[PDB]
């Protein structure tokens, strides 16, 4: 099952939740998936009016079962593994010199669609600081996303640091620690030590007058030898 | 490895040829602007903008005129990051070509190239920057607005005064922060009065934009605004006081 759900070019519906400082938002998005390219291309529309937050500290909250991996690396594929009952992904992520989120959501396959839903609460940000204070570009790095089995349950544990570009020139961190463990009963494959190498762009609809975030990604798996 | 990805770039699944692309762009040796600019005329859409991506990461201007060709591209996205690309490596014979991509029909592609256009910095673009300040997009005319700003010429102060009465917030603060970075004093008074802006972000630039700016003009808006000001234009007033002597 699990790669085979994959195969070709997947629908994909995100709902997310999210409370921050107090803010409540929610955000629904739309779009497709193609895990033979590792690309994503996905419109997210703030749902409640103005987003309280900017749109890139959100990219990586708002589905790594559309990871490439390689011919070689398919037994370390964890995320196509649990699917169609999917899995549970939790982070924490602490904006250097600020607040922080934490995170809960489920990636399943509903019908034919796969479907991330999302809880997310926000707190400690500071009200004129980056976040909060808007000072973020609008635009996204390149990185590695490193993820590693879990020693304990069937599982797997990923750490990495996202890179925002401020508009003043300097740079903003935001750590990513992460849990991902599988809804259903199906066995899943408990990988070798790896890494995603991520690629983002962000760009607007220009018939779109709600406060959205357009997206392509090219995400693939690598780190393993052959 | 790099050996590998250019090895790879030759591979029959275009996925192998899309990320051995991005690979030599992150890895940034110039042993792979030759290959990738043969990538740039893949029939994959994907690997296209994988090498133009790459191209622009690697920084090498032996790419200018392979990537000018791109911005011809039926590809959107493959268009964008042709642009996008011209302005991170910074040549000047990309000017001209990105000039004409102003009137590219994506707007994101139009966006693009103005922001190459700033970030290359050449005067040339000055003029058509001032035109795509009223373009239809709102995300056009506040990167138009931000590259006027970094190009730093005089010929934009008045165009961008007007900006600051856009209908939207984000260009009227883009235009606020680049009347800031060019420094003319013709702005002093248009930015006081858009300390009274209903938008707190135009506000806040609009203050900075002042501190900025400087000199005796602005002490003593200052000095008066101290006085017959209210709300958050006094306090602006009463803190550079205090600061400023």
Known sequence: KGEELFTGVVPILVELDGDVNGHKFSVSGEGEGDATYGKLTLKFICTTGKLPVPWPTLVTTLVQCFSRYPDHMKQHDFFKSAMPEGYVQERTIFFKDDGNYKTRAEVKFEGDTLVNRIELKGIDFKEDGNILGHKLEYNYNSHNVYIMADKQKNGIKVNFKIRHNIEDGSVQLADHYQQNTPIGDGPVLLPDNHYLSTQSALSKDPNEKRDHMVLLEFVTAAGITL | ?245
């Open chain 2, 1 to 245: 490895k790099v050996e590998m990805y250019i090895k790879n770039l030759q591979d029959d699944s275009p996925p192998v040829r899309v990320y051995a692309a991005f690979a030599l762009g992150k890895i940034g040796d110039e042993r792979a602007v030759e290959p990738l600019i043969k990538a740039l005329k893949d029939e994959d859409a994907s690997v296209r903008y994988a090498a133009a991506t790459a191209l622009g990461q690697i920084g090498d201007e032996r790419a200018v005129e392979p990537l000018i060709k791109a911005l011809k591209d039926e590809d959107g996205y493959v268009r964008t990051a042709a642009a996008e690309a011209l302005g991170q490596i910074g040549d000047e014979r990309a000017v001209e070509p990105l000039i004409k991509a102003l009137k590219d029909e994506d707007p994101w592609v139009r966006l693009t190239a103005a922001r190459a256009l700033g970030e290359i910095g050449d005067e040339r673009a000055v003029e058509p920057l001032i035109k795509a300040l009223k373009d239809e997009d709102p995300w056009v005319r506040l990167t138009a607005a931000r590259a006027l700003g970094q190009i730093g010429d005089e010929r934009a102060v008045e165009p961008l005064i007007k900006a600051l009465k856009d209908e939207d917030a984000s260009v009227r603060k883009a235009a606020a922060v680049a009347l800031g970075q060019i420094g003319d004093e013709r702005a002093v008074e248009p930015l006081i009065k858009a300390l009274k802006d209903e938008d707190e972000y135009v506000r806040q630039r609009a203050a900075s934009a002042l501190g900025k700016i400087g000199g005796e003009r602005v002490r003593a808006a200052m000095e008066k605004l101290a006085e017959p000001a209210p709300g958050f234009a006094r306090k602006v007033a009463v803190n550079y006081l205090e600061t400023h002597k």
